[PDB]
Motif scaffolding. Structure first.
Motif, PDB file in Angstrom:
ATOM      1  N   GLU A  99      66.796 -70.812  76.356  1.00 13.76           N
ATOM      2  CA  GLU A  99      66.565 -70.269  77.691  1.00 13.76           C
ATOM      3  C   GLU A  99      65.090 -70.300  78.070  1.00 13.76           C
ATOM      4  OE1 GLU A  99      67.756 -68.791  75.130  1.00 13.76           O
ATOM      5  OE2 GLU A  99      66.940 -66.782  74.784  1.00 13.76           O
ATOM      6  N   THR A 153      63.774 -72.631  81.255  1.00 15.00           N
ATOM      7  CA  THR A 153      63.000 -71.952  82.290  1.00 15.00           C
ATOM      8  C   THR A 153      61.609 -72.560  82.419  1.00 15.00           C
ATOM      9  OG1 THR A 153      64.222 -69.885  81.960  1.00 15.00           O
ATOM     10  CG2 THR A 153      62.074 -69.731  83.038  1.00 15.00           C
ATOM     11  N   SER A 206      64.876 -64.887  85.172  1.00 14.03           N
ATOM     12  CA  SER A 206      65.269 -65.531  83.932  1.00 14.03           C
ATOM     13  C   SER A 206      65.335 -64.518  82.797  1.00 14.03           C
ATOM     14  CB  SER A 206      64.284 -66.643  83.574  1.00 14.03           C
ATOM     15  OG  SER A 206      64.608 -67.235  82.328  1.00 14.03           O
TER      16      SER A 206
END
Ligand SMILES: CC(C)CCC[C@@H](C)CCC[C@@H](C)CCC[C@@H](C)CCOC[C@@H](CO)OCC[C@H](C)CCC[C@H](C)CCC[C@H](C)CCCC(C)C
Ligand SMILES: CC(C)CCC[C@@H](C)CCC[C@@H](C)CCC[C@@H](C)CCOC[C@@H](CO)OCC[C@H](C)CCC[C@H](C)CCC[C@H](C)CCCC(C)C
Ligand SMILES: CC(C)CCC[C@@H](C)CCC[C@@H](C)CCC[C@@H](C)CCOC[C@@H](CO)OCC[C@H](C)CCC[C@H](C)CCC[C@H](C)CCCC(C)C
Ligand SMILES: CC(C)CCC[C@@H](C)CCC[C@@H](C)CCC[C@@H](C)CCOC[C@@H](CO)OCC[C@H](C)CCC[C@H](C)CCC[C@H](C)CCCC(C)C
Ligand SMILES: CC(C)CCC[C@@H](C)CCC[C@@H](C)CCC[C@@H](C)CCOC[C@@H](CO)OCC[C@H](C)CCC[C@H](C)CCC[C@H](C)CCCC(C)C
Ligand SMILES: CC(C)CCC[C@@H](C)CCC[C@@H](C)CCC[C@@H](C)CCOC[C@@H](CO)OCC[C@H](C)CCC[C@H](C)CCC[C@H](C)CCCC(C)C
Ligand SMILES: *C/C=C(C)/C=C/C=C(C)/C=C/C1=C(C)CCCC1(C)C
Ligand SMILES: *C/C=C(C)/C=C/C=C(C)/C=C/C1=C(C)CCCC1(C)C
Ligand SMILES: *C/C=C(C)/C=C/C=C(C)/C=C/C1=C(C)CCCC1(C)C
Ligand SMILES: CCCCCCCCCCCCCCC
Ligand SMILES: CCCCCCCCCCCCCCC
Ligand SMILES: CCCCCCCCCCCCCCC
Ligand SMILES: CCCCCCCCCCCCCCC
Ligand SMILES: CCCCCCCCCCCCCCC
Ligand SMILES: CCCCCCCCCCCCCCC
Ligand SMILES: CCCCCCCCCCCCCC
Ligand SMILES: CCCCCCCCCCCCCC
Ligand SMILES: CCCCCCCCCCCCC
Ligand SMILES: CCCCCCCCCCCCC
Ligand SMILES: CCCCCCCCCCCCC
Ligand SMILES: CCCCCCCCCCC
Ligand SMILES: CCCCCCCCCCC
Ligand SMILES: CCCCCCCCCCC
Ligand SMILES: CCCCCCCCCC
Ligand SMILES: CCCCCCCCCC
Ligand SMILES: CCCCCCCCCC
Ligand SMILES: CCCCCCCCC
Ligand SMILES: CCCCCCCCC
Ligand SMILES: CCCCCCCCC
Ligand SMILES: CCCCCCCC
Ligand SMILES: CCCCCCCC
Ligand SMILES: CCCCCCCC
Ligand SMILES: CCCCCCCC
Ligand SMILES: CCCCCCCC
Ligand SMILES: CCCCCCCC
Ligand SMILES: CCCCCCCC
Lengths: 231, 231, 231
Positions: free
Chosen positions: C163, C167, C223
C-alpha cells in the motif's frame, strides 16, 4: 560586468565552485553506504550554494551601496547569504564525523548563525564606529565555535576509530586556520578600515572560500572515515 | 540613541539579556549529561539571540518607518527577527521535556512560524484596516499553540517522571500567561490602535521578553527534570 | 483590490487553500498513530502557508514592481516565500513515505532550496537576458529532484509494503507532472517572455498550486500507507 576591477576574481570563484560541485556530484554517483551518502550530500551542497552566490556577485545582483565615511561604499551582501547556509553545513560535516551529541550540534549551528547574522548587520551599518561593535560580537561567536572544535570534539575523536580521528584532526586544523582569516580580511578591507582595496579583498576571500569548501571537501571525500566499518 | 525616549528600556533589555546569556553559559560549563546539554544549548541561545536584536534596536538599526494613518510610524522590525527564532526554541524546550512525538513538534513550530510571520506582515502593512486582519490570523495561530500545550502535552507529562511533570506544568503556565499578553500589547500599542505610546509599549515588551526568556530559563535549568534518571 | 484583473484568481486561491487547511485540520483530529500524525502535520501546514501568501497577494502586500524591458513589471514575490517552505514539506511527505535515508533527504531539500532561491533572483533581476540564466540554473535543480524521485525512491518503494508502494507511485506521478509545468508558465508568462498576460498566468499558477497541495493532500491522507501496520 567588466566595469568592476574585482570581476576577474568573481569569475574565477564562480568557475572553481561550479567545477568543484560537478566533481563531487560525479564522484558521489557510485556510493550506496548510507553513512557515506550523508557526507556526500552535505559536502556537495556547499560549493553548489557558493556557486550561485558568486554568480550573483559577478552579474551585479549581490552588490549594494552603503553610505558611511561620507561615501557610497560597495558592499557585496551575497557573501553572507552564502555563508549563512554553507558554514553550518561545514560544521555538520565535522560534527557527524565525531558522532557529536545533539546539544553540541545545536550550540555550534546557533553560534554560527549569530556569527554570520551580526557580520551582515555590521556590513550594512551606516554609523562607522558601530560597524566594529558588530565585528567584535561576531568574532566572539567565532571564538566560541573554535573552542568547541578543540575542547569538546578533539577529545571525542580520540575515542573513535583511528581513521576518523586522524581525518577529523586534519579537517579541524584546516578549518581553524582558514576561518580565522575571515574576520581579519573584513577588518582591514572595504567593510572595515579600508586599508586593502576591494579588488584585493575579493581575491583574498576567493582563495579562502575555495580552500575552505573545495579543498576541505577533497580531503573529506577521499577519506575512508566517511564509510561505516564493513566486511 | 538618547533622542528616542524609549532608549532606556532598550538599553535595560540589552543588559538583562546579555547578563542572562552569560549566567546560563557559565552554569552550563560543568554539565556532561547528554540530555542536560540539550536543554542548556536551547535555553542559552534564546537570550543570546534576543541580546543581539535588542542591541540592534538600541543602536537604531532595527527600526523603520511605516506610513499609515497619514503618519510615518516608527516600527521596530527587529522584534520579529528575534521572535522568529526564539519562540520555536522555547517551544522545543517544552516539547523535549515531555518527549513529544515528531509530528506534534512540527505542528507547533510551523504554527509558531505562521504566528510570527503574519505578525510581521501586519506590522509593515500600510493599509490601516488590513493590519488587524493579519493580527487576527496571527492570534488564531497562537490559540492553536496554546491548545496543544494544554490538550496534548499536559496529558503526556502525567505519564512521565514526577519531576518532569511538575516542572512542565509550571513552565506551561508561565508560557500561556506571558505569551497571551503579546497580542494585547500589539493591539493597543503603536503597531495597532495607538492608545499606549511607544515608550510605554517598549517597557511592556521588555518586561515580557525578560520574563519569558530569562525567567523561563532560570526555572528550567534549576530543575532536575533536565537530567536523565541515573544512579 | 479589484483594480487588478487577476484579483479574482487570487481570491479563489485564498478560499480554496483556506478550505483545504480546515478540512485537513478537522480530519486529523481523530488520529493518535504517531506515524499518521507526522503526515497530517506536514500536509496540513502546506495549504496553511499557501493561504497566508495568497492573501498577501490579494491584499497587495506580496507584489512589487521590477524594471526591465523599459517597463515597470508587476512581480508577485510572495509566491517564492510560499514555495520556499511548501515545496520542501511536500518532498518530505514523499521521502517519509518510502523511509528515505537522511543523506537523500538533505540532498532533495537542498536542491529544492536552490531551485526556489534562484527562481526568486531571476524574478527580481533587472537585466532582461540574465533572468533566463537564473531560470536555467533553477530548472537544472528541478531536474535533479525529479531524477532522484524516479531513480532512487521508486526502487526503494518496491521493497516496502504494497500500500505504501502504490500510494507513492501515484503521488510521484502527480508531482512530476504538476511541478514540471511551473518552469513553463514562468518562461512564457510575465516573469519571462511575456507571451501570456498576468491575469491568465495567475489562473494557471492557482490551478497548479491547488492541485499540487490540496489535491496531493487528499490522495495522501485518504491512504492507509500513512498508518503503521497494526493489529
Ligand atoms: C544521495 O546522496 C548523494 C547526493 O548528494 C549530492 C546531491 C547534490 C547536493 C544536489 C545539489 C546540486 C543540484 C543538482 C543543483 C544543480 C545546479 C548546480 C548549481 C549546477 C552548478 C554546476 C554547473 C552549472 C557549472
Ligand atoms: C538558531 C540560529 C539560526 C539563530 C540565528 C542568529 C540570528 C538571530 C542572528 C541575528 C540575525 C539578524 C541580524 C538578521 C537580520 C537580517 C537583515 C540584515 C535583512 C535585511 O534587513 C536589514 C534592513 C536594511 O539594511 O532592512 C530594512 C528594513 C526592512 C523593512 C526589514 C523588514 C524585514 C525583516 C528583515 C524581517 C526579519 C526576517 C529574518 C531576519 C530573516 C532571517 C535572515 C537571516 C540573515 C537570519
Ligand atoms: C554543549 O552544550 C552546552 C552549550 O550551550 C551553550 C552554548 C551557547 C548556545 C553558544 C551561543 C553563545 C555564543 C558564544 C555567542 C557569543 C556572543 C554573545 C551574544 C555574547 C553576549 C553576552 C556579552 C557580550 C554581554
Ligand atoms: C514551517 C514554518 C517555518 C513556515 C513559516 C510560516 C511563514 C510561511 C508565514 C509567512 C511568512 C512571510 C509573511 C514572511 C515575509 C517576510 C517579509 C516581511 C520580508 C520583508 O519583505 C516585505 C516587503 C517590504 O515590506 O518587501 C518588499 C519587496 C521585496 C522586493 C521582497 C523580496 C524578498 C522576499 C521577502 C523573498 C522571500 C524570503 C522569505 C520570506 C524569507 C523568510 C523570512 C521569514 C520572516 C519567514
Ligand atoms: C499533531 O499532529 C496533527 C496536527 O497537524 C495539523 C496542525 C496544523 C499544521 C497547525 C497549523 C494551522 C494553525 C492553526 C494556523 C491557523 C491559521 C490558519 C492560516 C487558518 C486558515 C483557515 C481559515 C482562517 C479560513
Ligand atoms: C540548504 C538550502 C536551504 C540552501 C538554500 C539555497 C540558497 C542558497 C539558494 C540562493 C538563495 C538566495 C538567492 C536568496 C536571496 C534572497 C534575496 C532575494 C532577498 C531580497 O534581496 C534581494 C535584493 C533586492 O532585490 O536585496 C537588496 C539589497 C539588500 C540590502 C539585501 C540585504 C539582505 C540580504 C538578503 C541578507 C541575506 C538573507 C538570506 C538570503 C535570507 C534567506 C532568504 C531565502 C530566499 C533563502
Ligand atoms: C565558505 C565560507 C566560509 C567557511 C566562511 C567563513 C566566514 C567566517 C568565519 C566569517 C567571520 C566573520 C567574523 C568572525 C566577524 C567579521 C565578519 C565575518 C562574517 C567575516
Ligand atoms: C521571547 C519572546 C516571546 C516569547 C514572544 C512571543 C510573542 C508572541 C506570542 C506574539 C504574538 C503576536 C500575536 C499573537 C498577534 C499580534 C502580533 C504578535 C506577533 C505580537
Ligand atoms: C505548491 C507549490 C509548488 C509545488 C511549486 C512548485 C514550483 C516549482 C517546481 C517552480 C519551479 C521553477 C523553475 C524550475 C524555474 C523557473 C522558476 C520556478 C521557481 C517557477
Ligand atoms: C589574513 C590575510 C591578511 C593579509 C593581507 C595582506 C594584504 C597585502 C596586499 C598589499 C596591500 C595593498 C595596499 C596597497 C594598495
Ligand atoms: C583527483 C583530485 C583532483 C580532482 C580535480 C578537482 C577539481 C576541482 C577544483 C579544485 C581546485 C581547488 C583545490 C583546492 C586548492
Ligand atoms: C497586557 C498588559 C496591557 C495593559 C496595558 C496597561 C497600560 C497602562 C499604562 C497607562 C496608559 C498610558 C495612556 C496615557 C499616556
Ligand atoms: C541564583 C539565581 C539568580 C542568578 C542571577 C541571574 C541574573 C540574570 C538576570 C535575571 C533577572 C531577571 C529574572 C527574571 C525576572
Ligand atoms: C504548461 C501550461 C502552459 C500552456 C499555456 C496555455 C495558455 C493558453 C491561453 C491563451 C494564451 C493567451 C494569448 C492571447 C492573449
Ligand atoms: C471527501 C473528499 C472531498 C472533501 C472536500 C475537500 C474540500 C477542499 C477543496 C478541494 C478542492 C480542490 C480539490 C483538488 C482539485
Ligand atoms: C539560519 C540558517 C540555519 C540553517 C542552515 C542549514 C543547515 C542546518 C543544519 C542543522 C543540523 C541539525 C541540527 C540538529
Ligand atoms: C522559520 C525559522 C524556524 C526555525 C527556528 C529554529 C528552531 C527549529 C527547531 C526545529 C525543531 C525540530 C523539528 C523536528
Ligand atoms: C579560544 C579558543 C582557542 C582556539 C581558537 C584560536 C583563536 C584564533 C584567533 C583568531 C583571531 C581572529 C581575530
Ligand atoms: C483555546 C485553548 C485554551 C487555552 C488558551 C487560553 C486562551 C488565552 C486567551 C489569549 C487572548 C489573546 C487575545
Ligand atoms: C531527467 C530525469 C527524468 C525525469 C524528469 C522528467 C523531465 C520532465 C521535463 C520537465 C521540463 C521542464 C522545462
Ligand atoms: C572609529 C573607531 C571607533 C573605535 C570603536 C572600536 C570598537 C571595538 C569594540 C571591541 C571591544
Ligand atoms: C479600521 C478598523 C477596521 C476594523 C477591522 C477589524 C478586523 C478584525 C478581524 C477579526 C475577525
Ligand atoms: C534576450 C534573450 C537572451 C537569450 C539568453 C538565453 C539564456 C538561456 C541559457 C540556457 C543555457
Ligand atoms: C563548468 C564551468 C562553469 C564556468 C561558468 C562560470 C564562469 C564565468 C565565465 C564568464
Ligand atoms: C555584560 C553587560 C552588557 C551591558 C552592555 C549593554 C548595555 C548598554 C549600555 C549603554
Ligand atoms: C473559510 C473561507 C475563507 C474565505 C476568505 C478568503 C476569500 C476572499 C474573499 C474576498
Ligand atoms: C587547504 C588546502 C587544501 C588542499 C587541497 C588538496 C587536497 C588533495 C587531497
Ligand atoms: C515569570 C517570573 C519568573 C521568575 C524568575 C525567578 C525564578 C527563580 C528560580
Ligand atoms: C491532481 C488531481 C488531484 C485530484 C484530487 C481528487 C482526489 C480525491 C481522492
Ligand atoms: C597535521 C595536519 C596539518 C594540517 C594543517 C594545514 C594548514 C593549512
Ligand atoms: C591556530 C592558528 C591560527 C592562525 C591564524 C591565521 C590568521 C591569518
Ligand atoms: C555572570 C557570571 C555568573 C557567575 C557564576 C555564577 C555561579 C555559577
Ligand atoms: C502552579 C505554578 C503556578 C505558576 C503560575 C505563574 C504565573 C506567572
Ligand atoms: C490562562 C490565563 C490567561 C491570562 C491572560 C493575560 C493577558 C494579559
Ligand atoms: C497510475 C497513477 C496515474 C496518476 C497520474 C495522474 C496525472 C495527473
Ligand atoms: C513526465 C511527464 C511530463 C509532463 C510535462 C508537462 C509539462 C506541461
Amino acid at each position: 560586468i567588466t566595469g568592476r576591477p574585482e570581476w576577474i576574481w568573481l569569475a574565477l570563484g564562480t568557475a572553481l565552485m561550479g567545477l568543484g560541485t560537478l566533481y563531487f556530484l560525479v564522484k558521489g554517483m557510485g556510493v550506496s553506504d548510507p553513512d557515506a551518502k550523508k557526507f556526500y550530500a552535505i559536502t556537495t551542497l556547499v560549493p553548489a550554494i557558493a556557486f550561485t552566490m558568486y554568480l550573483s556577485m559577478l552579474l551585479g545582483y549581490g552588490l549594494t551601496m552603503v553610505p558611511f565615511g561620507g561615501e557610497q561604499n560597495p558592499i557585496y551582501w551575497a557573501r553572507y547569504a552564502d555563508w549563512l547556509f554553507t558554514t553550518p553545513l561545514l560544521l555538520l560535516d565535522l560534527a557527524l564525523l565525531v558522532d557529536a551529541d545533539q546539544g553540541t550540534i545545536l550550540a555550534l549551528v546557533g553560534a554560527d548563525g549569530i556569527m554570520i547574522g551580526t557580520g551582515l548587520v555590521g556590513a550594512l551599518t551606516k554609523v562607522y564606529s558601530y560597524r566594529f561593535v558588530w565585528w567584535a560580537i561576531s568574532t566572539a561567536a567565532m571564538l566560541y565555535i573554535l573552542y568547541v572544535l578543540f575542547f569538546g570534539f578533539t577529545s571525542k575523536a580520540e575515542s573513535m576509530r583511528p581513521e576518523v580521528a586522524s581525518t577529523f584532526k586534519v579537517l579541524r586544523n584546516v578549518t581553524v586556520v582558514l576561518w580565522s582569516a575571515y574576520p581579519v580580511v573584513w577588518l582591514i578591507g572595504s567593510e572595515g578600515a579600508g586599508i586593502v582595496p576591494l579588488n584585493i579583498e575579493t581575491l583574498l576571500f576567493m582563495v579562502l572560500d575555495v580552500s575552505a569548501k573545495v579543498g576541505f571537501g577533497l580531503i573529506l571525500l577521499r577519506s575512508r572515515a566517511i564509510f561505516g566499518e564493513a566486511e
